[PDB]
C-alpha cells in the first residue's frame, strides 16, 4: 500500500505557532483524500485548485502539509489573495494556489485558564511576506523616526505577540488548528498519487 502519513500532521499532539509554521513533506506514497474529508468533522475544508473527489485520481511531484495554530476569525486569511496580520506577516498564499486549507476548533487542547502564552504570531513587519515565506527573526521593529539600535522601548517593538488563548472567549477568539495541503506539480516524477490510478496497472 505505502499510504501517506497524514495522521502524523493532522493528529500531532502539538502544533506550531503561526509565525514559525511547521512543514512536513509528503512523498513516495498513495493518499486517499476522501478518507481525509470524512476522517473527522472539520470546521473548514476549502480546496482551491481542485476538489477532493477529483484528487483521488491525480498525481503530484510532492505534497506539502504546512501546520500551525491561529484565532478562528483569522482562518479567513489562510486563503489566496488575502490581507491581514496573518496573511501578510506570518503565512502568505500565492494567488495561483492549488491546494486545500483545512482547519478545526482546538479549544479543548490549546486554550488554558488565564491564557496560553506559548502560541505566538508576528505583529510587526516592515514588508509583506512573499508566498510561502517563513520569518522567525526577532529584530526590533522601528515604528518611529528615531532608529532603535536593537534596544526595545518606545516606538521600538519586539515583533512577536502571544495569542493568550482563553476558553472564556467567543469562538472567533478561540484557537484553531490549521493544515494547508499544497500540491506541487514540477517537471519531476510524481511521488505522491491518488488511489484511482491503480486501475491503469491491472
Amino acid at each position: 500500500t505505502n499510504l501517506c502519513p497524514f495522521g502524523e500532521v493532522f493528529n500531532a499532539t502539538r502544533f506550531a505557532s503561526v509565525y514559525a509554521w511547521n512543514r512536513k513533506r509528503i512523498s513516495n506514497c498513495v493518499a486517499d483524500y476522501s478518507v481525509l474529508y470524512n476522517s473527522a468533522s472539520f470546521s473548514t475544508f476549502k480546496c482551491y485548485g481542485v476538489s477532493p473527489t477529483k484528487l483521488n485520481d491525480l498525481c503530484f511531484t510532492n505534497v506539502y502539509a504546512d501546520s500551525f495554530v491561529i484565532r478562528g476569525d483569522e482562518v479567513r486569511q489562510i486563503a489566496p489573495g488575502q490581507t491581514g496580520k496573518i496573511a501578510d506577516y506570518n503565512y502568505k498564499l500565492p494567488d495561483d494556489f492549488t491546494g486545500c486549507v483545512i482547519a478545526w476548533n482546538s479549544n479543548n487542547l490549546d486554550s488554558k485558564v488565564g491564557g496560553n502564552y506559548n502560541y505566538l504570531y508576528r505583529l510587526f513587519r516592515k514588508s509583506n511576506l512573499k508566498p510561502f515565506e517563513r520569518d522567525i527573526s526577532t529584530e526590533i521593529y522601528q515604528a518611529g523616526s528615531t532608529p532603535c539600535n536593537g534596544v526595545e522601548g518606545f516606538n521600538c517593538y519586539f515583533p512577536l505577540q502571544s495569542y493568550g488563548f482563553q476558553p472564556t472567549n467567543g469562538v472567533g477568539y478561540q484557537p484553531y488548528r490549521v493544515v494547508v495541503l499544497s500540491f506541487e506539480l514540477l517537471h519531476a516524477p510524481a511521488t505522491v498519487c491518488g488511489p484511482g490510478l491503480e486501475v491503469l496497472f491491472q
Partner: antibody
Amino acid sequence: QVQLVESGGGVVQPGRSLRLSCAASGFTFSNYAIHWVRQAPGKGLEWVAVVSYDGSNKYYAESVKGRFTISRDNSKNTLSLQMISLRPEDTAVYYCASVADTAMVPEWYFDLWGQGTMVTVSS
Amino acid sequence: QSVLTQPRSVSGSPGQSVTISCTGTSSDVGAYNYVSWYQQHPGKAPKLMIYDVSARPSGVPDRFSGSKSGNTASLTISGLQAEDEADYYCCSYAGSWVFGGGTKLTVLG
C-alpha cells in the same frame, strides 16, 4: 496512579490563619491549572480558587477574595493556599482538583480530585 | 452569589430512568457550553460524570447522558442501579465556576 494529596487541616479559632498544601504525583503538574474547591459539612460544593499553569494568573471567588492566597511551585510540584482572618463560614473540607495528562478533559473541569482535608473554624 | 437550581430530591425505581434538571441564567448555563456533572458518594470526593454538556469521561457508563436547552442543563440516568444512589451536582463555567444546590438521587428499594 495520578494522585493529589491535601494536608494542613485542623481546628483554628475564628480570626487566625492557616495554610493548606496539596502535593501532586503521577502527571505533569506544571502543565495544567489546579483549583481549590470546598464543601461545608452536610452542604454543597463551592469553587474557591484556581491557579494557571504559569503560576502568576490567579482567580478567586468573592466570598474568599482578600483572605485566601493561592500559589504553586512547579519545581516541587506543589501548591498552597494561605488563609487568613478565618470565619466559621469557612469550616469545610478543602479538595484540590485538576486534570491528568491522559484525560481528554480540559482543565476548566474537575476531573482529578484529592481526598480533601478538613478545616474547622470554631471558637 | 448565584447558585444553579437543582431539585433537592429525585426518586427513581431500579432499572428505570431519572432526569435531574439544573437551571441557571443566560450569563451562566446559557453563556457557554462548559457544563459538567459530578457524582459524590457519602464521605468521598466528587467524580466527573459529564463535561462539555454531553461528554462522558473515560470509564463513565453510557447510562449517564447530559443535555442542555436554553438556560437549563439536564443529567439523565438510565438503567438505574443501586450504586447510583448519591448526590449529584451540576456546574457552569462562564464567568466563574458556579455549582448547583445538589440533588440527592435515591434508588428506591
